[PDB]
């Protein structure tokens, strides 16, 4: 979905694959601005764009260079920005 | 992080584990309101709270009731809401 471009806190996606890291298809979400884009399309700095991060499971060989069964490692990946305020409403 | 409560588009989390589904620790993010909470703490309905969804890998036995190696199935999970507008800024 095109939420990345139409959100108040828009984000850009950055694909990656380290020599041993699997899967290859992982687009890391990075916030466009410090502030948020108000209804008038301007950036307001009394609000902040923050990336929502998810703890999940990714494929990794140990010992390396193996095309079989092994133990999978940890992965910390931001998947989308949101607009926060210092106030708990 | 407490972004879920301090975001303009706040969300509630809903934990689950189906009889065969693994891992047990999966909190599904659900949006609190249709509209977004403006700077003044009010809901504005010319903006919408949308859940950011992530396509990822989850543990599943086939044939069922097996504590060994098998093929893992598909999982569609919303991890956090964001505030959208019909305008592409």
């Amino acid at each position: 979905s095109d939420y990345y471009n139409r959100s108040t806190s828009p984000w850009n996606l950055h694909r990656n694959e380290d020599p041993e890291r699997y899967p290859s298809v992982i687009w890391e979400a990075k916030c466009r601005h410090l502030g948020c884009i108000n209804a008038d399309g301007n950036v307001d700095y009394h609000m902040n764009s923050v990336p929502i991060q998810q703890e999940i499971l990714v494929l990794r060989r140990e010992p390396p260079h193996c095309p079989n069964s092994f133990r999978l490692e940890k992965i910390l990946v931001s998947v989308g920005c949101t607009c926060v305020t210092p106030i708990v409403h | 992080s407490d972004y879920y409560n301090r975001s303009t588009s706040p969300w509630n989390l809903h934990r689950n584990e189906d009889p065969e589904r693994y891992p047990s620790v999966i909190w599904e993010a659900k949006c609190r309101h249709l509209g977004c909470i403006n700077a003044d703490g009010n809901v504005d309905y010319h903006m919408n709270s949308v859940p950011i969804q992530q396509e990822i890998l989850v543990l599943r036995r086939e044939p069922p009731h097996c504590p060994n190696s098998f093929r893992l199935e598909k999982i569609l999970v919303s991890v956090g809401c964001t505030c959208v507008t019909p305008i592409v800024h």
Partner: antibody, heavy 127, light 109 residues
Framework: EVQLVESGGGLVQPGGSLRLSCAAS????????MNWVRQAPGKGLEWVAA????????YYVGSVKGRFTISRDNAKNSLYLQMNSLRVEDTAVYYC????????????????????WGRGTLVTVSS | EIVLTQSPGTLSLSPGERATLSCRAS???????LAWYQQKPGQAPRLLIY???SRATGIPDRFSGSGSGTDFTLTISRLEPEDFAVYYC?????????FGQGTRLEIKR
């Protein structure tokens, strides 16, 4: 004994830079959000910037967009404000302040009010 | 941006009297998130009232808070010499936080 000590004031020319420093003595700094609130000689109180516990979030007043930068150092228990391209309207006494936090269950609740203030330094922007 | 207007600009009263301070908000202040601060010449502000009605740590019983939404009141029931200072209200329900322009309490004689 719980105190806040500002430093870094002084005369600056229009277009200049300054860096205010605030020493947060007598309490665990990492636990609180901090802010810079200014007061023009005689005029009232005005919020300048705010900062998250770890600096993950930096909030600013419209007038200081891309000119001022709040920053902290939980190890050196200090808060700083980087004031660039200073305009005469920036003439004021700047206070560093501590933001009241509460804990209901296992959840930290930040409130944008100031239970502790500093003595403030006077920044003068003139030719 | 919520705009707080305080009345009067300056209040001349004698110790023993009851001071009634007003803070009028341009918009409804969320969950009555309003604070009141005291400020003596040369010194830095001091928190008195939070959540529109709650007295801060150490603040004497004589200080009272009232209000909800747009109209908020600070009351000092039996005035003492150390109560004669400038008074600011501040809201923390709308981002950004804004302050009242102030009301000074002068010792009428």
């Amino acid at each position: 004994e719980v105190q806040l000590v500002e430093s870094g004031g002084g005369l600056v020319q229009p277009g200049g830079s300054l860096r205010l420093s605030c020493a947060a003595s007598g309490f665990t700094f990492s636990n609180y959000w901090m802010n810079w609130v200014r007061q023009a000689p005689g005029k009232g109180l005005e919020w300048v910037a705010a900062i998250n516990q770890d600096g993950s979030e930096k909030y600013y007043v419209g007038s200081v967009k891309g000119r001022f930068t709040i920053s902290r150092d939980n190890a050196k228990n200090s808060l700083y404000l980087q004031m660039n391209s200073l305009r005469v309207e920036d003439t004021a006494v700047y206070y560093c302040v501590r933001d009241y936090y509460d804990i209901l269950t296992d959840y930290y609740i930040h409130y944008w009010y100031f239970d502790l203030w500093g003595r403030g330094t006077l920044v003068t922007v003139s030719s | 941006e919520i705009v707080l207007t305080q009345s009067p600009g300056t209040l001349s009263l004698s110790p023993g009297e009851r001071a009634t301070l007003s803070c009028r908000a341009s918009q409804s202040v969320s969950s009555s998130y309003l604070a009141w601060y005291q400020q003596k010449p040369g010194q830095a502000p001091r928190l008195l009232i939070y959540g529109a009605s709650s007295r801060a740590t150490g603040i004497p019983d004589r200080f009272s808070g009232s209000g909800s939404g747009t109209d908020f009141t600070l009351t000092i029931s039996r005035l003492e010499p150390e109560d004669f200072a400038v008074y600011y209200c501040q809201q923390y329900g709308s981002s950004p936080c804004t302050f009242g322009q102030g009301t000074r309490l002068e010792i009428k004689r």
